[PDB]
Every structure is written in C-alpha cells, then in structure tokens.
Design a protein around this ligand. Structure first.
Ligand SMILES: COc1cc(-c2ccc(O)cc2)cc2cnc(Nc3cnn(C)c3)nc12
Length: 292
C-alpha cells in the first residue's frame, strides 16, 4: 500500500537534477488534491529504452536493499500501464547536493564540519561494501544534504554488484564515465572494486577541502597537469600516464596535514595498499575527536 504510488497523484513541483539517462524531480504525492500531500524526490528515465529500463530496475532494487542513516531512503516505485515505465520514489533532502551546498557556504563550513560529512560518507560507503556493491560514481555532486548535521549518498545509477567469485566488476562497454574520479585500473582495464571506490573517496575528500573552488576542481587540475590541449580519447591516455608517474591532485590550500595524508593514501597505484572504509571512518573520527 504505502510503497505503491499512483502516477496521476504526483504533482510536479521543480527539477532537481539531470543525469546521463534520466532526471530527478521534486513532486508532491497528493491523492487528496488539496496540496497537503508528502513532498518526495522522483527519479525517471529521459530515454526509457529496454536496456535503460533493465539497468534502472537494478538501481531500484539496489536502493531498496540499503537501510543506513547516510544512504538516501527508498520510498517506492510507480508503474505506467503498457510499456511499464518506472519512477523511483525517494525521500526529498531539502538542502540539495553537497557540491552546491559547499560551493554556496564555502569556508563558513569549518574543518570540524567537513570531517563530520567525511565520516558520514565513509560509513555509508563501508555499509555499501558489506552488500558487495560498488558505487563507481562517488563525488560531492552525488552526495545530498539532509540538514547541516547529516549527508547521505545518492545516485546509485552506476552501481554494480560484485560477482560471487571475484573482488572486482569489469565494465565491458562503458557509457559516460567520471574519469577524473577514476582509479588507474578503472581507466586502463575498466575494473571496479571497493578499492576503486576508496580512490574516488580520496577525490571527494579533495573536493571538500577545496570548498568547490571552480579553478581547483579535479577536471580543471588534471587538465592543467596533462595539458589543456589534450582532447577526447587523448585525455584518458595522458591521464593514465600521469597517474602511473605519480602525478596527483595537489594539497588544497589550508588543508590539514593529517587529512591530505588520507587523500594521498587513497590515491595509491597499488590497489591492495589503499585503506579500508572501516579504517577510514575510525581515522576520521579520531581526527574529529583530537580537533574537539
Ligand atoms: C540529483 O538529486 C537527487 C538525487 C537522488 C537520487 C537519485 C538516484 C538514486 O539512486 C538515489 C538518489 C535523490 C534526491 C533527493 N533529494 C534531492 N534534493 C535536492 C536536490 N537539489 N535540491 C535543491 C534538493 N535530490 C536528489
């Protein structure tokens, strides 16, 4: 009954985000037509092909199986008659993405606060790992802000389930890929694992401590390091060679030494040497404790 949402009762309120394959809208589920209904986040496909609907149904099952304080809450699904188009209903987190929230308030969010968000992201990621899911798209644009004290991981659109017998998932024909957040083995061999999500987490830590200063973004900085003249496939070729030669994002201005050390450990070329999310949450909570 409650996880079953009638499409005719969903009132469009505003556009929240546009993705690779779909979009997120803020809607009011109002089966009384008196504007007293619940506000929800609705994800739908812009191009609802057979393949996209199959991947979207997988994302829906992934989200429904996760129950953690730092993972967006699944609410339900809408089904259309005939071709069976799907809408994913979720809780609406009113402060928007962490990227936009941090870009808006900048240094008004102190290091203690950025570390509280860091800890929350590690715990969400650690929990994800227990289900053998690989996020593949961890970035501040995919983290949502519930309120000043809580962030949650969103956009499971690229998420993969590890096979029973392997610790990595190989993507045979990649679609749009966030290469500036990718581990070297993800760029070279299209292999994704808990360890490549740890690499991404290091880029998220970098994002947080740059306060989303446009000129300092991972695409602007990697582009500067490989040369702005690089285009299309040549960018991937030069990024791989850069990472292999220990080219890395710089320390963000005013970033504490203990935090920058964590980023650099996440960015190890040796997959086995990268820290675990269980250890990261422990280390971050110790740093917050020392800071307090
Ligand atoms: C892209 O935005 C969102 C994405 C998802 C999402 C999508 C797919 C998925 O598997 C899991 C979560 C959920 C969202 C929930 N609440 C908001 N709120 C918001 C956004 N902007 N502003 C101003 C308030 N945004 C959300």
């Amino acid at each position: 009954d409650p996880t079953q949402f009638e499409e005719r009762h969903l009132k469009f309120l505003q556009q929240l985000g546009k993705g690779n394959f779909g979009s997120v809208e803020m809607c009011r589920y109002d089966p009384l037509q008196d504007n007293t209904g619940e506000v929800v986040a609705v994800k739908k496909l812009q191009h609802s092909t057979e393949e996209h609907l199959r991947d979207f149904e997988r994302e829906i099952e992934i989200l429904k199986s996760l129950q953690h304080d730092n993972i967006v809450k699944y609410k339900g699904v809408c089904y259309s008659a005939g071709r069976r188009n799907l809408k994913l209903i979720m809780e609406y987190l009113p402060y928007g993405s962490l990227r936009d929230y941090l870009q808006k308030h900048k240094e008004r969010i102190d290091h203690i606060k950025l570390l509280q968000y860091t800890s929350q992201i590690c715990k969400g990621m650690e929990y994800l790992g227990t289900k053998r899911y690989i996020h593949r798209d961890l970035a501040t644009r995919n983290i949502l802000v519930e309120n000043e004290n809580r962030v949650k991981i969103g956009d499971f659109g690229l998420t993969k389930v590890l096979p029973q017998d392997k610790e990595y998932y190989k993507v045979k024909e990649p679609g749009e890929s966030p290469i500036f957040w990718y581990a070297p083995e993800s760029l070279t061999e299209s292999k994704f694992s808990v360890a490549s999500d740890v690499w991404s987490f290091g880029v998220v830590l970098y994002e947080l401590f740059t306060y989303i200063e446009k000129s300092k973004s991972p695409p602007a900085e990697f582009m500067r390091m490989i040369g702005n003249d690089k285009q299309g496939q040549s960018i991937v070729t030069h990024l791989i060679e850069l990472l292999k030669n220990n080219g890395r994002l710089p320390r963000p201005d005013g970033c504490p030494d203990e935090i920058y050390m964590i980023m650099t450990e996440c960015w190890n070329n040796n997959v086995n040497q990268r820290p675990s999310f269980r250890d990261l949450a422990l280390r971050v909570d110790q740093i917050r404790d020392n800071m307090a």
